[PDB]
Amino acid sequence: ESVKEFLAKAKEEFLKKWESPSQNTAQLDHFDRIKTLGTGSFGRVMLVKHKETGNHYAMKILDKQKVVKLKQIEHTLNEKRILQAVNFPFLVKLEFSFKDNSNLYMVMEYVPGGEMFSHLRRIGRFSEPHARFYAAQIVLTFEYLHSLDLIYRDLKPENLLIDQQGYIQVTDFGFAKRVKGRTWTLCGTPEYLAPEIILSKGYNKAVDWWALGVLIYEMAAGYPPFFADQPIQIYEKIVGKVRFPSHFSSDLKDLLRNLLQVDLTKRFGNLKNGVNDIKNHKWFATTDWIAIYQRKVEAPFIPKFKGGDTSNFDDYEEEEIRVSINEKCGKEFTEF
């Protein structure tokens, strides 16, 4: 009952920030560039150092022209607007944002541990306690996001960072949508799509609980439950024959049968008791939910701290950051 009050205040605060977003809280020459951490079809992520403070940040730089070319205006504006409005322990925080003639900039605290994806592929698979520790953080994060009527729709190890305490930071919010009924976009990453996203019928927040099932499976097995060479073939397998590795525990298989439940009216997380069917499942019996939320549980894995180290990121050709003399796509990004 005290949970209802906490989340009611959280929704009020979210909606106030959504309605009056922060804008223009730094500028590019406040930062020194150190290294490219990632590239994508319309932007880059840079390790930068704030000149005045010496603090390290991940700066996500989006090329406005490429965003427009690739039809990502609404998603990019949405990511920034969501990020500055949400507040939860396992969500990255937006420290600054601004724009110039060429680019949009979002500046987050640097997390040198990098992505869950790279740790998972290095180790192979996580033990069940290890996977459970991460899963519990996702469960709580979705309880929070769903209370705001947001569907997350972008869960995968690629969008999950491991911080210096060994806890999760969820990175990406372009796809997060307010949905109290149904929505219909074919949106997400193939291996993680619920059957009702692939099919033309509408879907709701239950797709996030399906995706949690996929994540737990991939964390525990080392590979996702439905895989193939091309997306169309992944979709066909999804639409529910799952096989479990023999090392999966009885409790883990039972949980996954109820999360990877094709019938969304039978899927855990989407029943009358909502998230509590998940929290009370036997696989989570050893999980101290409050202690996880408070980050008082000893993490199973702490990324080695090497001192601005980028050992957990790949190397990229370092290319210019060019700011045109002409303003590009001003009207489209006015609200950023």
Added chain:
Amino acid sequence: TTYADFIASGRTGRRNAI
């Protein structure tokens, strides 16, 4: 093995949205 089939036929690297 299933893992071998994942390496042979699955997508083992970082996965794009769409």
